[PDB]
Design an enzyme around this catalytic site. Structure first.
Site, short mmCIF file in Angstrom:
data_model
loop_
_atom_site.label_atom_id
_atom_site.label_comp_id
_atom_site.label_asym_id
_atom_site.label_seq_id
_atom_site.Cartn_x
_atom_site.Cartn_y
_atom_site.Cartn_z
N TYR A 253 0.83 -1.22 0.00
CA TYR A 253 0.00 0.00 0.00
C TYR A 253 0.86 1.26 0.00
O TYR A 253 0.33 2.32 0.25
CB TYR A 253 -0.96 0.03 1.19
CG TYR A 253 -2.16 -0.89 1.10
CD1 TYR A 253 -2.18 -2.01 0.28
CD2 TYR A 253 -3.26 -0.67 1.90
CE1 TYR A 253 -3.27 -2.87 0.25
CE2 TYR A 253 -4.36 -1.49 1.88
CZ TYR A 253 -4.37 -2.62 1.08
OH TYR A 253 -5.48 -3.41 1.11
N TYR A 470 -13.73 1.08 -2.74
CA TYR A 470 -12.50 0.33 -2.47
C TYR A 470 -12.27 -0.64 -3.63
O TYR A 470 -13.21 -1.34 -4.07
CB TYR A 470 -12.52 -0.43 -1.14
CG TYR A 470 -11.16 -0.72 -0.56
CD1 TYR A 470 -10.23 0.31 -0.43
CD2 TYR A 470 -10.79 -1.96 -0.06
CE1 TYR A 470 -8.99 0.12 0.14
CE2 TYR A 470 -9.54 -2.17 0.51
CZ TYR A 470 -8.64 -1.13 0.61
OH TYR A 470 -7.41 -1.21 1.19
N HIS A 471 -11.01 -0.68 -4.07
CA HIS A 471 -10.42 -1.61 -5.06
C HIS A 471 -10.93 -1.27 -6.45
O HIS A 471 -10.81 -2.13 -7.32
CB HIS A 471 -10.62 -3.06 -4.63
CG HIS A 471 -9.74 -3.44 -3.49
ND1 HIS A 471 -10.08 -4.43 -2.58
CD2 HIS A 471 -8.55 -2.94 -3.08
CE1 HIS A 471 -9.10 -4.53 -1.68
NE2 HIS A 471 -8.14 -3.67 -2.00
N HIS A 556 -5.79 1.64 -5.74
CA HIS A 556 -6.01 2.15 -4.36
C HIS A 556 -6.10 3.67 -4.28
O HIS A 556 -5.62 4.18 -3.28
CB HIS A 556 -4.88 1.66 -3.46
CG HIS A 556 -5.02 0.22 -3.18
ND1 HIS A 556 -4.79 -0.74 -4.16
CD2 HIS A 556 -5.45 -0.44 -2.08
CE1 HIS A 556 -5.02 -1.94 -3.65
NE2 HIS A 556 -5.43 -1.79 -2.39
CU LIG Z 1 -6.47 -3.08 -0.89
#
Ligand SMILES: [Cu+2]
Ligand SMILES: *[C@@H]1O[C@H](CO)[C@@H](O)[C@H](O)[C@H]1NC(C)=O
Length: 605
Positions: A253, A470-471, A556
């Site tokens: 991340y 998200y994603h 992300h």
């Molecule tokens: Cu993730």
């Protein structure tokens, strides 16, 4: 043997029609193109129009509109009567007939609420069809189904324009765990509409949750993630992956940015490897070596997160600037320059805001005037109301202060949104949700917004079909359209373990493409586009309306490779403005209408 009902539904012929009559019947003693639960952008079946006694509504059978209802009424026995009820309800644009329970739902008002469209035999949907002016609001195409959730995407550099988009998930098409020697990958030619998948095992890299940076020669450096130490190098020219040197420190991340000098700096990445703050490091493609930078200190760029240090050094807003500098615009309240000289260097550059904006969107829309757009995000990674606040951050010389001005609030709070700069240096923000909630559709914003930096004002664009939270990803396409896609993924404890227990309603193994207003004349017809008939030659910096845009990589809410270089119709001298690597040439009419980009490979002095 496939019986296809008139309306277009399809079973795999006496009990069959018995089964087509009972909305509750999947089996008998149902196999549509899409599965039940699938999200749609267009009716998969033959619609029906319908006129009220006083003089209209379109009806799609076997579908639902999910979301808050203004009204649910139990009387109603018939679609026509549900339709009647919508006309008599003030502000009713969408209504749902429930075949199983004789119920009519009036959907609550868009865009205040978000409403989705799903394949479901129990229901039929009714809608007053929106008249959308493509000249003001652009237009979305229809869902494109993809083998692999595109959690991460990048344009594959080619000549004379790129034709392909790789995207990737994790060991599985729709699931992740930890380390696994493998990534699932998808290849979408958006010239042919062709789509293939592949498992990438040779680099022993599960590339989920990685850093991404395009080098000088247009190879894509894919760094850490689930295999927290492993580095993968994608070669456009052989479409094969090569093992790079292990990073000095295991990260996931984290963000990476290509610098002035065709090196790559990365900082943070507490998601995978050790669960502690990660200092900077820098990759040299030439040495083919990583170098730990203990003095590129993580501590100043930490957010303060309810979930702690796991999240705090994640998804830094990094840009390579002049003479090997790195600007960090966020997400932390305060911004910082970082350098790779000696063992490190970090210094405060400015205060952007009074709260952190984790996975807020961020883009350099004017390199030549070092202008950076930022908006949205949330104080915490998750369980966090997103912000409407946005900023233009102005950067002059590396390691002197920088200028931050709050511009107008977005119309919608967005966590997990995605951003692209367009040839005109307008920014398109797509998706994200009112409250950051990992692995949810909840309050996904469907209305795209275009920020005009010349005006410092927002315009609302037409709505997409699927929530992109998200994603998810957004990324500029060579024909000046925005690709928006992904969402979801399921954690399973081990590699191979069954995905049967996962909620797939949050999985969106697909995309959709926006045509911005600028592709349309005032009458809704497609504008006439300038064509280009350019040397396919590595051109260097300073060598000889228009604009260059660096090919994007994206995961992300992090697009560290995209950069708009506006021109004089003549390249600039500074590589820290004109980051080396592959770009898009966009020649555009002085009304605003752009070309199909020609690929331009900038190289280092
Ligand atoms: Cu993730
Ligand atoms: C283009 O020329 C103008 C004046 O002609 C100059 O001020 C500017 O910095 C140059 N390039 C860009 C993209 O602004």
């Amino acid at each position: 043997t496939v019986w296809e009902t008139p309306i277009g539904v399809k079973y795999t012929l006496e009990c069959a029609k018995i089964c087509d009559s009972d909305a509750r019947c999947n089996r008998a003693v149902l196999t549509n193109d899409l599965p039940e639960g699938a999200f749609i952008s267009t009716c998969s079946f033959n619609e029906t129009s319908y006129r009220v006694p006083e003089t209209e509504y379109r009806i799609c059978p076997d579908t639902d509109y999910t979301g808050v209802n203004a009204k649910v009424v139990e009387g109603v026995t018939t679609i026509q009567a549900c339709a009647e009820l919508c006309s008599n309800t003030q502000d009713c644009r969408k209504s749902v007939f429930d075949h199983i329970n004789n119920a009519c739902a009036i959907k609550a008002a868009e865009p205040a609420t978000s409403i989705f469209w799903v394949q479901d035999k129990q229901f039929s949907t009714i809608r007053l069809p929106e008249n959308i002016d493509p000249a003001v609001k652009g237009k979305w195409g229809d869902l494109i189904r993809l083998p692999v959730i595109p959690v991460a995407a990048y344009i594959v550099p080619s000549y004379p324009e790129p034709s392909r988009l790789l995207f990737f998930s994790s060991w599985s098409n729709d699931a992740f765990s930890g380390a696994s020697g493998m990534t699932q990958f998808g290849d979408y030619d958006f010239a042919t509409g062709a789509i293939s998948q592949r498992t990438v095992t040779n680099t022993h890299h599960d590339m989920f949750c990685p850093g991404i940076s395009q080098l000088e020669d247009g190879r894509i450096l894919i760094q850490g993630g689930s295999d927290a130490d492993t580095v993968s190098i994608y070669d456009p020219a052989t479409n094969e992956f090569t093992r790079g040197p292990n990073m000095t420190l295991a990260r996931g991340y984290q963000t990476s940015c290509t610098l002035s000098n065709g090196k790559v700096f990365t900082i943070g990445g507490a998601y995978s490897g050790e669960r502690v703050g990660k200092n900077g490091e820098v990759y040299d493609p030439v040495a083919n070596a990583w170098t730990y930078l203990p003095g590129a200190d993580f501590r100043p760029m930490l957010t303060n997160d309810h979930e702690g240090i796991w999240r705090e050094d994640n998804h830094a807003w990094l840009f390579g600037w002049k003479n090997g500098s790195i600007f960090q615009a966020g997400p932390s309240k305060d911004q910082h320059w970082y350098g790779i000289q000696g063992n490190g260097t970090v210094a405060k550059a400015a205060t952007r805001d009074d709260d952190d904006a984790m996975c807020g969107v961020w883009v350099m829309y004017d390199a030549v005037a070092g202008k950076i757009f930022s908006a949205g995000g949330s104080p915490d990674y998750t369980d966090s109301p997103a912000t409407q606040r946005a900023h233009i951050t102005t950067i002059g010389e590396p390691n002197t202060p920088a200028e931050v001005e709050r511009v107008a609030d977005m119309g919608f709070p967005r966590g997990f949104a995605n951003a692209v700069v367009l040839p005109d240096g307008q920014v398109l923000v797509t998706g994200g949700q009112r409250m950051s909630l990992v692995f949810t559709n909840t309050d996904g914003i469907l209305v795209a917004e275009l920020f005009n930096p010349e005006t410092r004002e927002w315009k609302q664009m037409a709505p997409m079909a699927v929530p992109r939270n998200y994603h998810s990803v957004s990324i500029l396409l060579p024909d000046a359209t925005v690709f928006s896609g992904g969402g979801g993924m399921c954690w399973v404890q081990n590699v191979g373990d069954s995905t049967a227990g996962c909620d797939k309603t949050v999985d969106h193994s697909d995309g959709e493409i926006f045509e911005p207003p600028y592709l349309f004349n005032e009458d809704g017809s497609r504008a006439a586009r300038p064509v280009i008939s350019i040397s396919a030659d590595p051109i260097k910096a300073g060598a000889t309306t228009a604009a260059l845009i660096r090919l994007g990589s994206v995961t992300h809410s992090v697009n560290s490779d995209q950069r708009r270089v506006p021109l004089n119709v003549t390249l600039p001298d500074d590589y820290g403005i004109l980051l080396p690597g592959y770009y898009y040439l966009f020649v555009s009419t002085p009304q605003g209408t752009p070309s199909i980009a020609k690929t331009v490979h900038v190289i280092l002095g």
